[PDB]
Amino acid sequence: SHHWGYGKHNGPEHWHKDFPIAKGERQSPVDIDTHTAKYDPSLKPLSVSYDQATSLRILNNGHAFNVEFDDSQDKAVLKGGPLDGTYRLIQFHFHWGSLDGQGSEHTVDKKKYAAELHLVHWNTKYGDFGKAVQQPDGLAVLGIFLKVGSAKPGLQKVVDVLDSIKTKGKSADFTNFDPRGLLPESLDYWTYPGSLTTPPLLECVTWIVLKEPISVSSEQVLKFRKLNFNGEGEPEELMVDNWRPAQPLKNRQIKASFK
Numbered sequence: 001s002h003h004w005g006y007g008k009h010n011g012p013e014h015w016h017k018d019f020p021i022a023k024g025e026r027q028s029p030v031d032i033d034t035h036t037a038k039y040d041p042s043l044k045p046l047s048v049s050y051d052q053a054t055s056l057r058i059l060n061n062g063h064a065f066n067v068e069f070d071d072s073q074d075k076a077v078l079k080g081g082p083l084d085g086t087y088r089l090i091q092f093h094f095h096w097g098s099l100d101g102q103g104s105e106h107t108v109d110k111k112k113y114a115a116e117l118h119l120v121h122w123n124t125k126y127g128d129f130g131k132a133v134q135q136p137d138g139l140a141v142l143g144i145f146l147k148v149g150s151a152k153p154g155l156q157k158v159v160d161v162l163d164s165i166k167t168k169g170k171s172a173d174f175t176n177f178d179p180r181g182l183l184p185e186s187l188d189y190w191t192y193p194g195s196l197t198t199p200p201l202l203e204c205v206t207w208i209v210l211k212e213p214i215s216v217s218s219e220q221v222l223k224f225r226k227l228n229f230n231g232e233g234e235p236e237e238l239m240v241d242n243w244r245p246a247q248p249l250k251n252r253q254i255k256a257s258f259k
């Protein structure tokens with residue numbers, strides 16, 4: 001069974017032994033070199049249609065916490081930009097650091113943000129998530145960087161439930177949460193073809209990384225850092241530094257939606 005994590009003994013440098021696609025040709029995350037990305041005037045505007053989103057539950061899975069959505073119909077979808085067709089929101093989660101100077105998975109001119117939010121969507125032409133992850137255009141992940149500054153009010157409901165899911169395997173109801181409150185003002189983005197950033201590291205993702213970070217407060221990110229990787233009644237290991245570092249770009253181009 002799955003024994004991957006973020007520690008010295010089971011972290012990103014070990015993943016390749018069970019998941020050899022870790023050394024593949026379209027791995028994520030990557031550094032976004034802002035002076036090598038090309039503005040692509042053909043990209044359409046991005047369409048984030050989250051008005052009918054139905055959040056269900058929040059779960060600590062021992063790697064991060066996921067907010068799960070009802071993806072049984074086109075309720076919260078991503079379209080446009082580099083995408084063909086319609087991608088359904090299934091879950092969001094974050095990656096974060098032990099300190100404010102690290103935590104993001106993508107970097108921008110080698111800059112690491114405190115955290116990174118991933119909104120994971122799957123291509124409806126493949127009918128379910130499991131089938132989608134087997135296709136090179138199966139997922140669209142919207143990535144949003146977090147910096148520490150002013151509080152993000154649309155994050156606070158998430159921060160306030162984290163005490164109820166401290167350890168691995170704990171879940172809680174999380175209905176009526178509006179993921180629109182996690183977005184920045186601008187939808188300017190970079191895009192590139194890549195992979196899941198966790199095992200099984202499948203090369204099925206169109207990445208859409210927003211240029212504008214959102215600001216969260218030090219108190220809000222502190223609460224992320226109080227979570228635990230371990231299960232109840234096990235030795236406490238704080239859930240921090242659950243990020244994969246940047247991977248080789250290889251033969252890929254990162255495109256910008258903006259000049």
Ligand SMILES: NS(=O)(=O)CCNC(=O)/C(Cc1ccc(O)c(Br)c1)=N/O
Nearest residue numbers: 003004005009010011014015016017018
């Ligand atoms: N290539 S990988 O999937 O990242 C990591 C594979 N390594 C392992 O299974 C182990 C032994 C291990 C044993 C029991 C556990 O409960 C955990 Br956790 C890990 N490393 O010490």
Ligand SMILES: NS(=O)(=O)CCNC(=O)/C(Cc1ccc(O)c(Br)c1)=N/O
Nearest residue numbers: 118120130133141195196197198199200
């Ligand atoms: N950081 S991320 O790129 O957004 C990747 C977030 N990780 C994932 O969704 C998973 C869970 C997963 C669940 C069911 C599956 O069939 C497959 Br495959 C993966 N990795 O195991």
Ligand SMILES: NS(=O)(=O)CCNC(=O)/C(Cc1ccc(O)c(Br)c1)=N/O
Nearest residue numbers: 002004018019020021198199200201202
């Ligand atoms: N050698 S591989 O292709 O990476 C094995 C591929 N495994 C799968 O698609 C899965 C889904 C999965 C879910 C969560 C995980 O954490 C991992 Br890992 C894998 N089996 O459950």
Ligand SMILES: [Zn+2]
Nearest residue numbers: 093095118197
């Ligand atoms: Zn992620």
